[PDB]
Design a protein around this ligand. Sequence first.
Ligand SMILES: NC(=O)C1=CN([C@@H]2O[C@H](COP(=O)(O)OP(=O)(O)OC[C@H]3O[C@@H](n4cnc5c(N)ncnc54)[C@H](OP(=O)(O)O)[C@@H]3O)[C@@H](O)[C@H]2O)C=CC1
Ligand SMILES: NC(=O)C1=CN([C@@H]2O[C@H](COP(=O)(O)OP(=O)(O)OC[C@H]3O[C@@H](n4cnc5c(N)ncnc54)[C@H](OP(=O)(O)O)[C@@H]3O)[C@@H](O)[C@H]2O)C=CC1
Ligand SMILES: C#CCN(Cc1ccc2[nH]c(N)nc(=O)c2c1)c1ccc(C(=O)N[C@H](CCC(=O)O)C(=O)O)cc1
Ligand SMILES: C#CCN(Cc1ccc2[nH]c(N)nc(=O)c2c1)c1ccc(C(=O)N[C@H](CCC(=O)O)C(=O)O)cc1
Ligand SMILES: CN(Cc1cnc2nc(N)nc(N)c2n1)c1ccc(C(=O)N[C@@H](CCC(=O)O)C(=O)O)cc1
Ligand SMILES: CN(Cc1cnc2nc(N)nc(N)c2n1)c1ccc(C(=O)N[C@@H](CCC(=O)O)C(=O)O)cc1
Ligand SMILES: O=c1ccn([C@H]2C[C@H](O)[C@@H](COP(=O)(O)O)O2)c(=O)[nH]1
Ligand SMILES: O=c1ccn([C@H]2C[C@H](O)[C@@H](COP(=O)(O)O)O2)c(=O)[nH]1
Lengths: 508, 510
Amino acid sequence: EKNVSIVVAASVLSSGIGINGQLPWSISEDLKFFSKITNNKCDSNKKNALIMGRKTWDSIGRRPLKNRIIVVISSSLPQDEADPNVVVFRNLEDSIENLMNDDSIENIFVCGGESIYRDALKDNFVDRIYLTRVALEDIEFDTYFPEIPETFLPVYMSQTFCTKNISYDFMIFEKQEKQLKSIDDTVDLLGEIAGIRKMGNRHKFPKEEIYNTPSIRFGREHYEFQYLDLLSRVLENGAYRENRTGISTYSIFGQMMRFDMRESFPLLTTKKVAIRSIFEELIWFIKGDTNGNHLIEKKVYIWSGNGSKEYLERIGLGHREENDLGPIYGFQWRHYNGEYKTMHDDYTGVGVDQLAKLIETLKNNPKDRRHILTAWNPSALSQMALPPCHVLSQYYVTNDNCLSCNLYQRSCDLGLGSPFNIASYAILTMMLAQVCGYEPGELAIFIGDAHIYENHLTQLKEQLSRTPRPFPQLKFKRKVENIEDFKWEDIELIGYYPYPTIKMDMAV
Amino acid sequence: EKNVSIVVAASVLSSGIGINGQLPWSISEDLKFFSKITNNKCDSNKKNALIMGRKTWDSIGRRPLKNRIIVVISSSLPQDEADPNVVVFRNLEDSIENLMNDDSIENIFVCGGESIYRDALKDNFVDRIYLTRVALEDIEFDTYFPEIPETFLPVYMSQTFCTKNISYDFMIFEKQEKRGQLKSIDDTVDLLGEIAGIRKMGNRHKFPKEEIYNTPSIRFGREHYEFQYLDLLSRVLENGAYRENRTGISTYSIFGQMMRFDMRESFPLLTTKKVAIRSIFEELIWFIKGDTNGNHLIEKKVYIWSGNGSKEYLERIGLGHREENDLGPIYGFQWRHYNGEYKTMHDDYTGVGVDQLAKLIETLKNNPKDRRHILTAWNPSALSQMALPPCHVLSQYYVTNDNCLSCNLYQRSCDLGLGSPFNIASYAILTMMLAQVCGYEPGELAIFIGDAHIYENHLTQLKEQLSRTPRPFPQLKFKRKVENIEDFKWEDIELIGYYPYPTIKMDMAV
Ligand SMILES: NC(=O)C1=CN([C@@H]2O[C@H](COP(=O)(O)OP(=O)(O)OC[C@H]3O[C@@H](n4cnc5c(N)ncnc54)[C@H](OP(=O)(O)O)[C@@H]3O)[C@@H](O)[C@H]2O)C=CC1
Ligand SMILES: NC(=O)C1=CN([C@@H]2O[C@H](COP(=O)(O)OP(=O)(O)OC[C@H]3O[C@@H](n4cnc5c(N)ncnc54)[C@H](OP(=O)(O)O)[C@@H]3O)[C@@H](O)[C@H]2O)C=CC1
Ligand SMILES: C#CCN(Cc1ccc2[nH]c(N)nc(=O)c2c1)c1ccc(C(=O)N[C@H](CCC(=O)O)C(=O)O)cc1
Ligand SMILES: C#CCN(Cc1ccc2[nH]c(N)nc(=O)c2c1)c1ccc(C(=O)N[C@H](CCC(=O)O)C(=O)O)cc1
Ligand SMILES: CN(Cc1cnc2nc(N)nc(N)c2n1)c1ccc(C(=O)N[C@@H](CCC(=O)O)C(=O)O)cc1
Ligand SMILES: CN(Cc1cnc2nc(N)nc(N)c2n1)c1ccc(C(=O)N[C@@H](CCC(=O)O)C(=O)O)cc1
Ligand SMILES: O=c1ccn([C@H]2C[C@H](O)[C@@H](COP(=O)(O)O)O2)c(=O)[nH]1
Ligand SMILES: O=c1ccn([C@H]2C[C@H](O)[C@@H](COP(=O)(O)O)O2)c(=O)[nH]1
């Protein structure tokens, strides 16, 4: 008995691990990771053994690895003797015996060639798989990682990283075989006694059947889990409620989500997200625009319904022309407190420009604590087609000169709105970072009424059955001078490989 | 081997457990807890044994406990085979002996009397201690739970509960003599951290080192909500970035963090330092009445808004033309007269500006499930006239299906050392007030911080605080049902069972 682990790097969609006797890419961090995992051991007078196939041997210059013993599988290679850090076997099965003996061998790693992976998995020799998911998928491959067998379950998944615009995961799987007992025994007995009265009961852990990729118990580091686990928590504990819209929701109050923005862009991968619409709705905010026709003109219908004659009629704004949403987001951002008459009037100079003051303060007085944008105007709400959901947002220049964002959101709808805000404020923050001279840092979203519309239950349950994939990267093709000059065309999505788009109808 | 646990309920400060042959209180959740912990077992063919002194056995009426075996330590009581569910032993040590005897015995509980506890601990018989800390002192006790020996560390502390206004609290201590979920995941996350450094968000949120983490041996059971404040503290202490600011005094800062606090079973007043509760109530209702006159506070001997309401400060910021302690359209002006025109702190502003606190109340009452119960103080039009731009910037309220009122607050900037304890207490109280007035019960308070920072002239004070294990939170009850939210008065408030550590002096950053 001694541990056997595969170590592989494979393309996210098709497990492409090689082309023309070489890799499909060069990613140093991955070689570094390979170096750390294969070198790692306790008793420092033993060596780990790296098993590989002759073509892979061939592939790295037949040049030995520091501090490790290579084991080449070949029919032809002479079992040499020049070198003791490189040994040769005629088949994979006998190459083990590694186990039995060489007590000078702590761990065994299967380092691949397809033919070798395929044999290790078929003859059931491997216990763990360390898999580096690489997000590049329209390139030639002639070598694949075989399908992970059912006996294996994912138990870790890291955040997404970036190298020269390529996103990658790493990820661990364990061959399955079948804190205190006291602390949990206590917490449960107090839970039985107290019922609703113990706050832990009001915040129950989600059940396996509604928790995305359940085997991943202690390694939920991919920040997309921050979104999916939120979904589970409400699936789990949400109270059923009626609301102004016909359609009722499951709801809980006071939640939060966090996303890295240094290494990747947080566009959900568990459903294809309408990034264009998101972007297009953002510059419309930025420009201070409240004319819904401008979005519709670019073929973005997200605000259609809240600007229809009937909807505005139903809510007291029947005096408005179709699509005059009144002083909603964009207007409070550039014209805070301005007096709104119609989308046709000229507002240049009226009201506080928050957004301009934001940029000025952000470049001139970075460490100061007042970088705030707010849409919550008690005096305007009744003229808005909808009061805002994303209500207030605070911005933060780190000592190392990234820009982070906090968004307070009164009423994210988890199914539709939420994945939008995530992307939206990510971008707003990247935009502010170009314009002000910083790099993107972190995004934290604080939620008030976090809920799911009931007509989304099955759809979101579908989403919850899909294991997340590395986030993509998002780059600007040019440096702008004023932030209102950004255009869709400027924007580059690198490496977005989502699952099918999931249809969800918006409750009006 | 075979577990021996002490189970005891004791007063938080002096460890009182008994007076005149009885308990100094009557708290049935505790008897429920006792019963659960002592009945709990795997093998339906074995039983647990509870050990007690004769006088304790007298205490419970000499009747057996369902489903368990009582073992009475007495010199004199007869060893009579009548009850198979009660056996007498002449000494604790022999009774311990349950350990090899009675394969039929699964677990062992020392159920007390001071003399059985003292003996069990002195003779080192015992592995774990289940302790219910009862928050009333200043009453008569004649029996005590011994001081817990240094060989035990605490490993769990529950949230605070309430019964007939008495706060209480469950903890476990383990005899500890001679990350980790398994190796493979911590190793991999460690290796990744090394490859990536600052590039892996995990390295940006490093775990607090043991010497700065409050009560470190409690690692998987930091349930007491006091820990939400303390752990935040240790977190900026471990990752907080240095930065100079508008005050000569620099801060250590991180960005984006949160705290939850229950308000159904207790009042979230920090116990690890005596907190100026009066001054908090007096500012709070100052805000509710919509008042901006700094004098009204000083007149009630509350000096928190003095430094910011003085002649020099008002000068240095461009408000020289303002009467002393005219603070401007700060918090309560915006709550009552959002966007109204600020003349002076003397004008009458009846009917001016949007009255948010009124709309709030109307909305909680008539539209409980609506998502627009919102209180805001961030008014870009009015920042400059303000002695100080607001820190508790926005709050939301939420009526649960079982009629409790919850509050979320977004705080852009938060002095962990000084303002934060005020904010927790402040908004717990406001929420309790809003709840009474609207017909509901207190629910939960969540607090979202933008800039969470510790002032550098505070480090040693907060380090001191971090070395004190928290005690169960007190209760706060209103003595009468007010008709209007601005009628509340300090006199109307009762603070039951607040037992803090001594106050810790910290200088304000002007
Ligand atoms: N992305 C990643 O993580 C990795 C990718 N790769 C890529 O994979 C490709 C190489 O893989 P692959 O084409 O499978 O070649 P392999 O590395 O699997 O080597 C194949 C050779 O191994 C020997 N061998 C295999 N099975 C047996 C057996 N049953 N008995 C005796 N000898 C055996 C034979 O050598 P002989 O002919 O001498 O008999 C065979 O030709 C390259 O593109 C490489 O870059 C490789 C490792 C990792
Ligand atoms: N708050 C809590 O959780 C609890 C509180 N209590 C309270 O504590 C008080 C009772 O405790 P306490 O006064 O210490 O009495 P105990 O329950 O410890 O009983 C004392 C008796 O136990 C027997 N005993 C003790 N030591 C020996 C020995 N070494 N050899 C032989 N017999 C021994 C003796 O009985 P005999 O005289 O027959 O020889 C002695 O008088 C009451 O107020 C009770 O309500 C009790 C349990 C729990
Ligand atoms: C958040 C936010 C901004 N908003 C604004 C907005 C306005 C009123 C609202 N009203 C309600 N009840 N829920 C909302 O989420 C909501 C959102 C959004 C509105 C609709 C979609 C939407 O239907 N998105 C696509 C379909 C359109 C597309 O493909 O572009 C989807 O089905 O996912 C997204 C965001
Ligand atoms: C929040 C808020 C309102 N405010 C107003 C206010 C004004 C300027 C500020 N400036 C800075 N830098 N930090 C602050 O927290 C702060 C707070 C407070 C100011 C001081 C104390 C304070 O020193 N409190 C007691 C001591 C006095 C007492 O016992 O009453 C303490 O030490 O806890 C609390 C609140
Ligand atoms: C077998 N092989 C192909 C290869 C490439 N990438 C991989 N990536 C992963 N994740 N797993 C593999 N098995 C893997 N294999 C290898 C093996 C070692 C080195 C190598 O250079 N290793 C150095 C690491 C060099 C570095 O630090 O950059 C070492 O010290 O181990 C390169 C390719
Ligand atoms: C020994 N004693 C005094 C007493 C009271 N409170 C305590 N509380 C604690 N935590 N620990 C003790 N040892 C303890 N002891 C007792 C013990 C049992 C019962 C009792 O009635 N027990 C019933 C209680 C059942 C119930 O009320 O649910 C049981 O089934 O266990 C009362 C007093
Ligand atoms: O960024 C956004 C834009 C608005 N909405 C949704 C949330 C609610 O479903 C709806 C507002 O509902 P009420 O507060 O009006 O009831 O708008 C979002 O979730 N996110
Ligand atoms: O309710 C309040 C009143 C103000 N402050 C503190 C927070 C900051 O320490 C200080 C303002 O600092 P600057 O934003 O001026 O830098 O006031 C609070 O924390 N809470």
